[PDB]
Amino acid sequence: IHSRKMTTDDDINWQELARSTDEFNGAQLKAVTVEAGMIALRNGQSSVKHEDFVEGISEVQARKSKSVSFYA
């Protein structure tokens, strides 16, 4: 519903992304689709790949990584 607004490429599969995100709330998910076009602007494009949404998973979630673990 978000990505309909912006322009995507035609190699996108919306189940791939949905598998790889688990327990993401709609505000997070809005925050991936926006985040992909940041990365697209940095590469310098005019279309938004399917690889970018995948990198917006890590750059923006809810938490910065699992933490420092020293024997966890």
Binding site: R19, S20, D22, S65, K66, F70, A72
Partner: protein, 231 residues
Amino acid sequence: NNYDGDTVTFSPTGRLFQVEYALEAIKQGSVTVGLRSNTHAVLVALKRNADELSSYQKKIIKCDEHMGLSLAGLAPDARVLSNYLRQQCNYSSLVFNRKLAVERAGHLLCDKAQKNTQSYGGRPYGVGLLIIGYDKSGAHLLEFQPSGNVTELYGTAIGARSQGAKTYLERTLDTFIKIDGNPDELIKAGVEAISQSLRDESLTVDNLSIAIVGKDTPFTIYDGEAVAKYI
């Protein structure tokens, strides 16, 4: 700390919050995947180094020549429990001249958790174990929780991104049940299972740790260049 403190309290929700805190020990743990066919059990564990000069920390402990456990969570707790399990397995060999059954040892482990959940000044253990073995009733994979819950599953996971492994196993479930007498296939399927639970933490030949048990094969741990056949 209102009802959150102590392993003696309730909890107007009926709960206790110490248990959930201890399950966070699973969450900050590294992912491990277990799957069993009807002739082989396989645990595939993602070891993890502290830094480049450091080596990787073991994740699979041999309990017996037909029995193995792999930890997820705090190492120091895993250590108490593994000793205990070996103790009673050697016990059963001694007194009954019999291999210790998996189904049974889950229950023993259950009570051992319960009683540090009973008394004041105890704690719940912050380690969840996957225990595979091959006995006179065949292959078994048990899941052990900080709650003290033992469950029998075809294939399961614990750690971080455990969900992405479960979905994989939900698709390939009826595949690996029909594969029997070909341990190689089960191992490959577990490598693929734990590929879904990477943080771009690539599978190396000393980051992946395999351990198997078969009908015809004692418990074995593969590491080093023994894992390259599958990577």
